[PDB]
């Protein structure tokens, strides 16, 4: 019985921290990707905007 | 003696086991990478591209709009 559950323990801590480790990490890669895509979307968005208010000049142009 | 030696023998088959955990947990953030990179690669290949279409159907509205101007 006890082998099992003082080993257990150390298996638990380690687990532990270790998942905190690559959560970090996976959270680094999902901050760097996002502010990545959120430029090229905001840039696309800009123009957009652009498009769209020569578009209503176009069509109050008749 | 004996007393020492499981000791030793129980030590050395926790740190093995401790050693096969940190190797299985490294493969399970591996597969938890590859899902999110292509959780969010996708989501913003969608995102992008439905601007980019956006951005051409204005663009052919534009030219209608003052093709009817110049009619």
Known sequence: QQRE???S???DTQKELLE???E???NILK?????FYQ??????????????????EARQQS
Do not use: F, N, P, V
Request: proline share 0%; with cysteine; aromatic share 6%.
């Open 9 to 11: 323990e150390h298996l």
């Open 31 to 35: 901050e760097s990707l996002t502010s």
């Open 39 to 56: 430029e090229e979307i905001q840039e696309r968005d800009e123009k957009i905007e652009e498009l769209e208010a020569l578009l209503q």
């Open 20 to 22: 905190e480790m690559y």
């Open 24 to 26: 970090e990490k996976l």
């Open 5 to 7: 559950q003082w080993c």
